[PDB]
Subunit: 115 residues, 4 copies
C-alpha cells in the first residue's frame, strides 16, 4: 500500500538507485524507522510495507536527493526531500508518493486510492 | 511509443476522462492532426500511435485541462496545457508525457527511454 | 497588468535573457503578435502592455526555453513553453505568469491579484 | 539574506498568513528554532534574519500548509512542507525559498543570487 516513484527532470528519466527512508511518528513524538529501500531502474520503490504493518499514523518519506545528484556531478541545493502525511486515518488506502527532481527544485504529489 | 499520463493535484488522484489531441508539424509548417484520445481510470492514455507511424518530427500534445476542471466546478486559469517537442530525431524512442494539474498551475515532464 | 517571470531549476537562479512572445487570439482563430521582450537579470519581463490594450480575450505566452538551454550547453526536451489563458475583467487586475524551467520539465503558475 | 515565498495553485494567488518556521541544525543533530513569521499579503515573508546571524550550516524551513488549506475548508494531504538545505558562503548571498501549494502536491525551488 505504499509506493515511491522518483523522476529526474534534467535527464528525462527515472531516478534510479535513490535511497528512501520511511519513518512513523511514535507515541512519544519521535520518528521511528519504519522501512527503507532504493528505487529500481523504473524509478519505483515497491515492497516497503504490508497492509497489516501500515497502520494509521503520521509517516515521513525521506528521499535522499543530495546523494543522487552528487553522483551525477551536480552539487544540489537540498539535503533531501521529505514528505510528511497522515495515512489510513479513514481506513486502509494505497499511496503513491511521486517526486520530480531538479538540482535546485523538486515537485512532489500523492496519488491516494481506495482498494 | 507515446503515452500521456495526467494527475490531479487537488484530489490526489489520476485525472480521468481528460481529452488529449496530438499534432505533428507538416512540411508547410501547419499542425496536422496526428492522434487523439482520453485518459483512462488510471490517468493514462495508451495506444495513440505505432512505432511505424511515429516518425521523426515536431509534435504537440494538447491536454484539454479546461474541460476537465469545469466538470469539477472549478473555473480554471489555462485553456489547455500544450507540450511541444521534437521526437525520434536520433532514432526511435519511447515517450511518456506526464502532467500534474491544479486549477491555476501545471507541471509537465517527459520520460524518454530507448527500447 | 501582465508580467512574465522565468526561473532556472538547474542553477537555482533567474532565467536571464529568455525571449518571450505574447499573442492574442484573433476572430479568425489565428494568433496575432501582441508583445514581446527578453527577461531581465531578475528573470522578469515587465512593461509588455498597458491596461488599455490588455482587453478580455485569449492570450498565449510563448517562452523560448530551447534557446535558453542551448546557450548553457544543455540539451532540452521542449521546443518552447506555451501558456494559454483567458484574461477576464471580473477577476483581479494583475497577472503574473511564472515558469520554472528544467531541461525535461517545466512548472507554470499564474498569480492573479488586485 | 533569506526570504520565503508561498503561492496557492488552486486560487492563483499568494498564500497569505501561512506560518513559517526556520530551524538551524545544532551540533547534536537536533533542530533549533531560528526564525519564524507569517506570510504577508504578497505571500512573502521578509526579515527573518540578518547577514551576521545567517552563518553556514544546515537549515530547515517548515511551511504550515495543513492549516492554510484547513482555513479554506479544503482537506489536504501533507502535514507541512519542509525544505532542508545548506547555506554556503562561496555561493551567492541571497536565498529565496519559494513553494507553490496544492492540496495534494507542492513544488519548491530555490533562487540564490548576488
Ligand atoms: O507516474 C507519475 C509520473 Br510518469 C509523473 C509524475 C509527476 C510528478 C510531479 C510533476 C509532474 C509529474 C507523477 C507520477 Br505518480
Ligand atoms: O517569484 C516566484 C518564485 Br521565486 C517561484 C515561483 C514558482 C513557480 C513555479 C513553481 C514553483 C515556484 C513563482 C514565482 Br511568481
Amino acid at each position: 500500500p505504499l509506493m515511491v516513484k522518483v523522476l529526474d527532470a534534467v535527464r528525462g528519466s527515472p531516478a534510479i538507485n535513490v535511497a528512501v527512508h520511511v519513518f512513523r511518528k511514535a507515541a512519544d513524538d519521535t520518528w521511528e524507522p519504519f522501512a527503507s529501500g532504493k528505487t529500481s531502474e523504473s524509478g519505483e520503490l515497491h515492497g516497503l510495507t504490508t497492509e497489516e504493518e501500515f497502520v494509521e499514523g503520521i509517516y515521513k518519506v525521506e528521499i535522499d536527493t543530495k546523494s543522487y545528484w552528487k553522483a551525477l556531478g551536480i552539487s544540489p541545493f537540498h539535503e533531501h526531500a521529505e514528505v510528511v502525511f497522515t495515512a489510513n486515518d479513514s481506513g486502509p488506502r494505497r499511496y503513491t508518493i511521486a517526486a520530480l527532481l531538479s538540482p535546485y527544485s523538486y515537485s512532489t504529489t500523492a496519488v491516494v486510492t481506495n482498494p
